[PDB]
Amino acid sequence: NFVPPAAPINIVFKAARIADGKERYDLRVQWDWNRGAGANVREFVLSYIDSAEFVRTGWTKAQKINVGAAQSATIISFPWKVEHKFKVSSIAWGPDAQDVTDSAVQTFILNESTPLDNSFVNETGIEVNYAYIKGKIKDGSTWKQTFLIDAATGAINIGLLDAEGKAPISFDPVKKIVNVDGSVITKTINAANFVMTNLTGQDNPA
Amino acid sequence: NFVPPAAPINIVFKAARIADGKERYDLRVQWDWNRGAGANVREFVLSYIDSAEFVRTGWTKAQKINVGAAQSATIISFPWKVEHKFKVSSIAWGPDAQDVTDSAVQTFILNESTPLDNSFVNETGIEVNYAYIKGKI
């Protein structure tokens, strides 16, 4: 009396933004499977592949993981900004052999829109992020930050800040400028360091 | 009429090079299990341990993950340049209890040789890599 079951339905996605640091993005897959026809489904198998990889080859060499009876499995470190094709399989089991009915393809990608359960922002002093890699020193209610690199404006920052948006040896290759100051030890030069420029007339070489 | 099954064979490895950034190396395990003797195998269990850890202690405290009926499970963030001993178990199931037949050990490590399905190079401006950490615009 074995009869093939029906595929899962009501596929729903969600994710937890990060881990402690490194911006490890966690992707969870949830779905609902109904009852009333076919056989009592046994377990599942979650298979998915890269969006740009499906076009070249279809559902072969794809990413696959085992699933529990809870109808929801999770990928703990999901790639960021690279889409993916997600399919969930309702593998059955019969006395002699089995047979599988799959759900319809459903592609999704996590972005800055609608994460949840995101309470893994635990400052550690070296906060590596997909949007910036930086180093800061925690203190009181003053998150004093020293090192920074931002993948939004190429800003490279070092040392505590006193300027409105700059620090003594911070940098900005955008609208390029090499900004530094002070030298405790100086026993050498190679060129004069004599002229003054950035104003041909009103920065008098001196 | 329960009879122990046969171990999986034709073990084959492969990997996807990276994720978006951070060079998260993804390792997939694929194998083929045949039919004709013993019982109808039920599911599997993929167990593996560090190369330098097996010598000190054997197949205890080893890394183990559940497996599906597809005969292929994947490790999404595999250590780089540190070898590993991989074994796949064909766990059976009988009316009173079960019994497992394992495949032969097969160690492998991902390196700069022969990755595939590697289309996760998505520039983000802070490209952290095992070979370099850099920031570009």
Question: Entry resolution in angstroms?
Answer: 3.9
Sequence-distant (6+) residues with CB within 8 A of B37 are B3, B5, B6
Q: Report chain A residues whose CB lies below 8 A from the CB of B126.
A: 128-133, 149, 151
Return the beta strands (E) in A17-108 as ranges.
Answer: 26-32, 44-50, 63-67, 72-75, 84-91, 100-102, 106-107
Interrupted after residues, chain A (C–N over 2.5 Å): none
Instruction: Identify the residue among A25, A65, A84, A129 best suited for mutation to test binding to B, counting B beta carbons within 10 A and taking the highest.
Output: A65
Phi, psi of A17 (to 5 degrees): -55, -55
Residue closest to A134 by CA, chosen among A112, A118, A158, A111: A158
Quickly tell me which residue has 């001993």 as its tokens: B85
Name the percent of chain A in helix, strand, coil, to the closest 5. Answer: 5, 30, 65
Interchain pair B19, A129: CB under 8 A:
no
Q: Report chain A residues whose CB lies below 8 A from the CB of B89.
A: none
- A156 to chain B, any CB pair closer than 8 A? The answer is yes
* Angle CA B62–B63–B67, to nearest 5: 130
Whole-angstrom Cα distance, residue B102 to residue B46?
10
Q: DSSP string covering B14-69, please?
A: EEE---SSTT--EEEEEEE---SSSS----EEEEEEEHHHHHHSSSSS-EEEEE-T
Whole-angstrom Cα distance, residue A40 to residue A93?
8
- A126 to chain B, any CB pair closer than 8 A? The answer is no
Interchain pair B76, A80: CB under 8 A:
no
Q: How was this structure determined?
A: cryo-EM
Counting one residue from A and one from B, how many pairs have CB atoms under 8 Å apart? 102
Give the up-direction half-sphere exposure of residue B19: CA atoms within 13 A in the CB hemisphere.
Answer: 24
